[PDB]
Ligand binder design. Sequence first.
Ligand SMILES: CN1CCN(S(=O)(=O)c2ccccc2-c2ccc3nc(N)nc(C(=O)N4Cc5ccccc5C4)c3c2)CC1
Length: 209
Amino acid sequence: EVETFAFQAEIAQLMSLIINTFYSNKEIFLRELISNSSDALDKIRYESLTDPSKLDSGKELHINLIPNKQDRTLTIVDTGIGMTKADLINNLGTIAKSGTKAFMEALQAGADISMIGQFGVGFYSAYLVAEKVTVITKHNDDEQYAWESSAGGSFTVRTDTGEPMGRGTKVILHLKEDQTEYLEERRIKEIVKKHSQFIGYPITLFVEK
Ligand SMILES: CN1CCN(S(=O)(=O)c2ccccc2-c2ccc3nc(N)nc(C(=O)N4Cc5ccccc5C4)c3c2)CC1
């Protein structure tokens, strides 16, 4: 049902440094997940040019940001390309490996954490604000999958037999107790305007009631 896997040692190291380093500019995680979402949105927009059948699983290309005070989650939804089980288990780790090691070196050298994006590993910035990250994803040529990790060296991958999303990805951030500021409407807006005002898809913030 659920499979557990170790992260690439370097991604594990990176994650450990994200959690155990005193860094007050935690807001960067949102620019990174939106930029990832945008990248994944570009991929499907492009694949669809060659083959328009790739939008049968959803024609709209957008990012939604959903804060939820009750569950204390900030969910970043996108209708991008989404991930295969292969991407979740093998590809993502392998493609992050070199960027992770460069980032590790940059940090020891003196580089700021905000620099993580430039090494293609901005996703793991989620762990500055999240105690657990749950990613639901669905790619046209694969089933829906739930990827979950609270760091500590491992992640789990399972078929998500919940509500089907069509195509795309939800990164569900189980925010730390001290990091609920990212659930505030005015705060999400501030970060989006300041960091990623140049994303070529509509970013809708869902107002909680
Ligand atoms: C810098 N990144 C370069 C690569 N991509 S990509 O081109 O889309 C891509 C190319 C190959 C294989 C897959 C993807 C792909 C597709 C859709 C994606 N959608 C979202 N929302 N996020 C990501 C993402 O980067 N991560 C990182 C990560 C790490 C652990 C667990 C989960 C995740 C999710 C996505 C990645 C995203 C931008």
